[PDB]
Design a protein around this ligand. Sequence first.
Ligand SMILES: *[C@@H]1O[C@H](CO)[C@@H](O)[C@H](O)[C@H]1NC(C)=O
Ligand SMILES: *[C@@H]1O[C@H](CO)[C@@H](O)[C@H](O)[C@H]1NC(C)=O
Ligand SMILES: *[C@@H]1O[C@H](CO)[C@@H](O)[C@H](O)[C@H]1NC(C)=O
Ligand SMILES: *[C@@H]1O[C@H](CO)[C@@H](O)[C@H](O)[C@H]1NC(C)=O
Ligand SMILES: [Ca+2]
Ligand SMILES: [Ca+2]
Ligand SMILES: [Ca+2]
Lengths: 368, 238, 122, 100, 100
Amino acid sequence: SPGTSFNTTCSSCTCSGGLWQCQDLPCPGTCSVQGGAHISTYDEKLYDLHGDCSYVLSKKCADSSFTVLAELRKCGLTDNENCLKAVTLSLDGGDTAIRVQADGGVFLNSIYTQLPLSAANITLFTPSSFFIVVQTGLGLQLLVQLVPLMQVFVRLDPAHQGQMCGLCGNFNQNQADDFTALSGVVEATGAAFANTWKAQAACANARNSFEDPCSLSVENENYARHWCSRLTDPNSAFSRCHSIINPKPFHSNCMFDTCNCERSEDCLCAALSSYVHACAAKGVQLSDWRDGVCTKYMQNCPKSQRYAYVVDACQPTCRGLSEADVTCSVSFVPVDGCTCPAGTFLNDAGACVPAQECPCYAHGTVLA
Amino acid sequence: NPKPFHSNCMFDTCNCERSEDCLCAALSSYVHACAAKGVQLSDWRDGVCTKYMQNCPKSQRYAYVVDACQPTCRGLSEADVTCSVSFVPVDGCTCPAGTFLNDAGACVPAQECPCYAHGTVLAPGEVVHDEGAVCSCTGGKLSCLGGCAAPMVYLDCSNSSAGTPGAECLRSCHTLDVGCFSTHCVSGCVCPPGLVSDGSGGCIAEEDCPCVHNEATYKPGETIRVDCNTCTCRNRRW
Amino acid sequence: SPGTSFNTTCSSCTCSGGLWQCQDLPCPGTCSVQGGAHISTYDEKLYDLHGDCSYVLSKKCADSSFTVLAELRKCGLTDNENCLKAVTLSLDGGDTAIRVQADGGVFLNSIYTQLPLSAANI
Amino acid sequence: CVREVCRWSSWYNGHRPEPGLGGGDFETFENLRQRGYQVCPVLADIECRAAQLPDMPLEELGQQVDCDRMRGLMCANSQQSPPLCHDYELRVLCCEYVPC
Amino acid sequence: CVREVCRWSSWYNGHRPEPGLGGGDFETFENLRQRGYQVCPVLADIECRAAQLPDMPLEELGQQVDCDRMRGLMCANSQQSPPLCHDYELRVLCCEYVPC
Ligand SMILES: *[C@@H]1O[C@H](CO)[C@@H](O)[C@H](O)[C@H]1NC(C)=O
Ligand SMILES: *[C@@H]1O[C@H](CO)[C@@H](O)[C@H](O)[C@H]1NC(C)=O
Ligand SMILES: *[C@@H]1O[C@H](CO)[C@@H](O)[C@H](O)[C@H]1NC(C)=O
Ligand SMILES: *[C@@H]1O[C@H](CO)[C@@H](O)[C@H](O)[C@H]1NC(C)=O
Ligand SMILES: [Ca+2]
Ligand SMILES: [Ca+2]
Ligand SMILES: [Ca+2]
């Protein structure tokens, strides 16, 4: 009824004047690399990248304030079988380098650094066992997925709009300019654009891939079809996001991954997790979508932890409840993963005990 | 003058509950102050404070003079910003010389320890394919290939401190601009300063690098048509 | 013999003029707290301190560029049985904190940090 | 009476992984049986490791290895970058029941 | 033939430390024998842990507590700042011989 309003995640529209009067709330841009090959830029120009090098994922190409790098590595017989393998946030013109590997190992200036870590305004912590958050004050936040495989997500305070360069595009609300290279022209296809952003001159240029791996194996065909079809099913858990995000690119990603992936379940669940996480970024809480699928990621949790579909904050810790924590002052999209249940906390030993079993800490002293 | 140190030792030991601890602490303090002044006291724990020899972590041994860096395998792989700090030589438990501690913390000789490329473990005495190059983890050091003829001359990482931009970070018609990233130097033929390579083993000035558009390569002086307009390649630009 | 010189770690002296011509090479000063009670200042003024608090061990007092703090705690029946229990390098006006405890645990902004670490030139 | 008596086995390195794309290490219980290595029909848990790096665990390596109590250990060259494997081995746990 | 059979013993929390300056926790073998707890005269290792906090090792506690496998566990209030101890207990490893 006219007089009413409705605000999306990115804009608010009021029903008036016989039309929708739409203003925009500021929206942090979101790049992502999913499946080790597919890239969704800030302008949402989805494109596939089958490369084997280190690529400048994003960079404020006026200066060298920050430089997110991604190392994509070929993972099989086929040239188009890739996995993300690292995320190397260079910073201060290379003075600092936070390198998140694919096993979860985090290297601060090429030195192992456990998590969390809070220094130089940079905060590294794991909301759950599946994700690592690298929050910086320079504007960008990295949210990196390790389970079931390696994917990367990048968030930008919209202040950097129309300033960045790199694979994820200049973030200026224009999909036709995303392939602007350093030579002033829009590149043609994905790989031709990416081969201008390689880190090392000795890398091999990425190649355009037409051959669908789905055509190879009929059993791979039926497996990938019967599972990835759970995306576009209007009765599925995912339907709640269909009216917001078109799931066709995500279904293509799931098909291509599962058919091409040697670990079909891993890439399949990576695609489903990617769809869920994108939708939850848009502001929909997809839940209970792992019915009869991807349950080996339910079970494989570290002991005394448990799965959770909506993890939307820091991890409750005995140290934190004793003396506060810088960690819990970071807003990130609610990801899923393994965490301690509510009413419990993990002590410095990491085991999950109730509040009664964990001690208060004064001056760093364990006070039982 | 050791009189204040003797008074400290007396007061500590007569007051300390584990008076051995405070006694050895005072003797260590005198030794360290003397080493600060520039004297190397050694073998001073004759029949005294030997429980600090014995309690060493496994695979480590005591050392009277630790005058610099702790030798790490990661460092011999990819250098170490930690290890260029001048501190007065202190004593303590350390890995024995010629041996290094792996990421597990145990101490092994150089031959048992992998070389770390991009932070990836690579077992010793193994040759791997990477970036069209053939590399090997020999005794903890990583050595890779893939004595020249054209103006570009060889560059070897053996002399340079670990971490220099090697042949992989070669000034090139593409990486001249983006700036190269590599934690592992590689030896190879590199153009003399003032030029770059064409990618095929030649040397070209930086103001004639061919422009690349849509998988193609265009020499300077070539023109292309994009949509309704025409661009021309000059100084690696359109 | 004449013409000879000998250099200490803090100075260099040449035997000439029948005397020692001594110049002073730069010397980094050295404070220390030993035994948990005794303090050797930068001026080498040894004195004992039996305290139960956290004391500002050293601080460039024009501003707050750094502040090395030492917490000294009583350790026995008698009031003069003390132990150093922490060393809290407060930095950037307290914006950064590196706390080395007595058992070896090092805390960067009250977060456990294994060693080595290398950030913010630290 | 009858009580379970159980113990670990020794280290079994029956192959040296081959350079290339199809190469790697394939240490399987069926291959162990064929080669003459004793394979217990029943087990509780097994442990895999790299033979040349006996300290740093499997997850610290970061390489793609699948190692399970029912099958054994497998590392394929093509799945890692560089496309190679390390030289792995594994050991098993055998438990029988002895009269008290 | 005779085979070694070792085994841990359970937790022996035999004291509640008293607040004050001279109080503390003194879990000593002879006191354990006097209180009725079975303590094996021959042993290899013992393990101490804070009774209320069974997860973090003794070292992470940072308190001056000394355990020796021949004599027991001691914590005195004065040595620690704050002038109090935690609550501790230990276990012993008892080993004997059984005919093959
Ligand atoms: C969005 O609209 C709803 C419904 O009118 C309202 O409750 C909510 O406060 C709005 N969000 C704002 C104003 O940020
Ligand atoms: C944050 O960044 C500023 C600017 O580089 C720096 O001065 C400061 O030390 C950093 N940390 C904090 C806690 O402000
Ligand atoms: C210290 O004196 C010796 C003896 O003359 C000399 O060899 C050395 O170079 C001197 N150190 C300096 C000049 O730094
Ligand atoms: C070192 O200090 C400078 C001066 O504040 C600062 O800008 C820089 O970020 C610090 N770190 C490095 C690696 O230079
Ligand atoms: Ca754009
Ligand atoms: Ca083998
Ligand atoms: Ca007790």
